[PDB]
Amino acid sequence: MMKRLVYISKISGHLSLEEIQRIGKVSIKNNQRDNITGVLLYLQGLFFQILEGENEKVDKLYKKILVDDRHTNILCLKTEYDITDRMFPNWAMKTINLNENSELMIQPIKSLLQTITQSHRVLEKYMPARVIYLINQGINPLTVEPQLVEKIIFFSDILAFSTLTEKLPVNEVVILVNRYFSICTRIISAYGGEVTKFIGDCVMASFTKEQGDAAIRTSLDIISELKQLRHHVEATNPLHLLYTGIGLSYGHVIEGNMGSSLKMDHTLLGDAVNVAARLEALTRQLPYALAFTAGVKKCCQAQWTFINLGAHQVKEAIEVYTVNEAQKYYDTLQITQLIRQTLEND
Amino acid sequence: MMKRLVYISKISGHLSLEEIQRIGKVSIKNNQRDNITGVLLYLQGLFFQILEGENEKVDKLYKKILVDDRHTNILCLKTEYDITDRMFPNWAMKTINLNENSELMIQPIKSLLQTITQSHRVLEKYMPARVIYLINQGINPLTVEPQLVEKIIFFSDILAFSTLTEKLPVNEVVILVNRYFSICTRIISAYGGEVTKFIGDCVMASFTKEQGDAAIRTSLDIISELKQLRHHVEATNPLHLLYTGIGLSYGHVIEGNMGSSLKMDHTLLGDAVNVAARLEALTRQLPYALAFTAGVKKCCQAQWTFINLGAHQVEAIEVYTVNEAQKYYDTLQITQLIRQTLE
């Protein structure tokens, strides 16, 4: 049985024509051995490749391509399974430099391909991570049926954000929120979590039930990086005032497409979403910057020092936990007052 | 001064090759007259068009193309301003049927164009409407600066949704939330509001300060349509149990594109967002399904019967409603009825 995959990628740095030639000859040699055929196109710093052959041979090759140093931001766009006919039966690997094609009748198609691909790469950034995952796996996200899944829900947001927005100019708030989002997204994604959306200054993400310790480590790493950042910058930098609170919950959530023709999105539905947001808010009243449910605790295997913060009610009460490592070295009320007083000019 | 634009669209059904030819014939005549050049391509049910010429000539033509019933789901991908040279100076409008091209050396580029565009159209379905607007207006959403704007913030969600999710099968929950979202989104959009996002079962939207009355009307209309729905369906249908609460607030919010190269989103930043969400939760404790701030009230000019609900801690703020938002039911009895109905 044969398959065919298509992917796009960003060429790492500036790549010479001779090293692009060094991809072609090795590809031709290996693909002839593996009975692989396909085409490699490049255009304005982007690679396009189509690979076809028996499934095991194609998957082995794509695993190696994925770790190749010469390109990055790799997104597989389409996978066709159990294909009847090869698309390029005579090309072990045909390389086409679309930049060098100056023919007048191909310029329209070449222009459209560059415009649509560059637009595609922008849109990719706005997708929930789950959608990018499904596309990478060759699954059309629009046709996926919703599933009840077990997830750890993550919410983190900015301490005293109302004071920051009240006292800072808009451009300074934007720099600060972008930095916060950049840090959260990088760390969540490094631990295998999936960012779902930004809501105001809040980052929403999920982890699997096998990722309880990764979820805690994510949260502590966020807190740790913010603490580092506050003493890295000057006192006139609003980043000097950036703190977070984090809530985690665990439960059954429905994951999938929701909405209508007018607006559709990837959503997560279930009690755990509300609980994680409420625990995120509760950290304001706690001497800890991370709060989570008993269910999150049961998903952890590491030797955390779990601390029981008692039962709290969520708009029936739920046990709230934290870890000793999440303890605040500051008093939260004193810090929100310091933030306001730091931003006071009078 | 000249501009160049590129858009993609979905060919409307039943569009034959003779009709596409007539499009080319008229385009050539009009574009020659207006000194417009470009190319029209089609492939597997999609149009691609590049248009270039003087700003006003191009804009007037594009406004016409926007209302042409021979295509739908039009997205202007890119606008180049102050172009120096035309890309197709000799083609008033060259029509290219990519479906008919069988040349072997073109097949790779044709295949990739179809793959990437179809994937692009999937991604578009998940994009924030505000980002799709910016792209259509030729604005780079990754570089355009967020702005401080005055907005009415709208928050609604489903009453006792925890009980619904606890007691219903997945496919039934999905049908129910989709219906709720479809109703909210259609009404908000009909009144000129902008749905921002879905957060769980919650709908977040915004209106301008000139849209105070429209925000109240939207809210009452959603409540009204849910009431209609509950007595349209049978008692075994979970939609029979669908109620909403709505909060509105007014304030300054930063609106824009935020994040990093790893993940972007469109967001509204400001205290008004939290206030609207807390007033939405407060309706559970109120004999009204709509609650809003003094600031919202000041944005209204219609002759509502405003009702003061006293100061509430969300310093406490004055909460208001309108007489029409009164609940004909007792909220705690409804939540107990939802629990009991699903037993």
Ligand SMILES: Cc1cc2nc3c(=O)[nH]c(=O)nc-3n(C[C@H](O)[C@H](O)[C@H](O)COP(=O)(O)O)c2cc1C
């Ligand atoms: C864009 C791109 C496309 C590539 N395509 C192929 C290919 O089709 N076949 C292949 O064998 N190697 C291809 N490679 C290179 C592989 O990643 C790898 O360098 C090559 O298989 C040699 O691996 P080896 O020295 O460990 O055996 C490609 C690399 C890049 C950057």
Ligand SMILES: Cc1cc2nc3c(=O)[nH]c(=O)nc-3n(C[C@H](O)[C@H](O)[C@H](O)COP(=O)(O)O)c2cc1C
């Ligand atoms: C995909 C598509 C592309 C079109 N491109 C052009 C064009 O480039 N120039 C043009 O005059 N009309 C174009 N039209 C048709 C116009 O929308 C309109 O039907 C035509 O200009 C006649 O308009 P009229 O009612 O003012 O006579 C296009 C229509 C479609 C569906």
Ligand SMILES: [Cl-]
């Ligand atoms: Cl290149």
Ligand SMILES: [Cl-]
């Ligand atoms: Cl800290």
Ligand SMILES: [Cl-]
């Ligand atoms: Cl610990």
Ligand SMILES: [Cl-]
């Ligand atoms: Cl509720």
Ligand SMILES: [Cl-]
């Ligand atoms: Cl009602």
Ligand SMILES: [Cl-]
């Ligand atoms: Cl009234």
Ligand SMILES: [Mg+2]
């Ligand atoms: Mg905050």
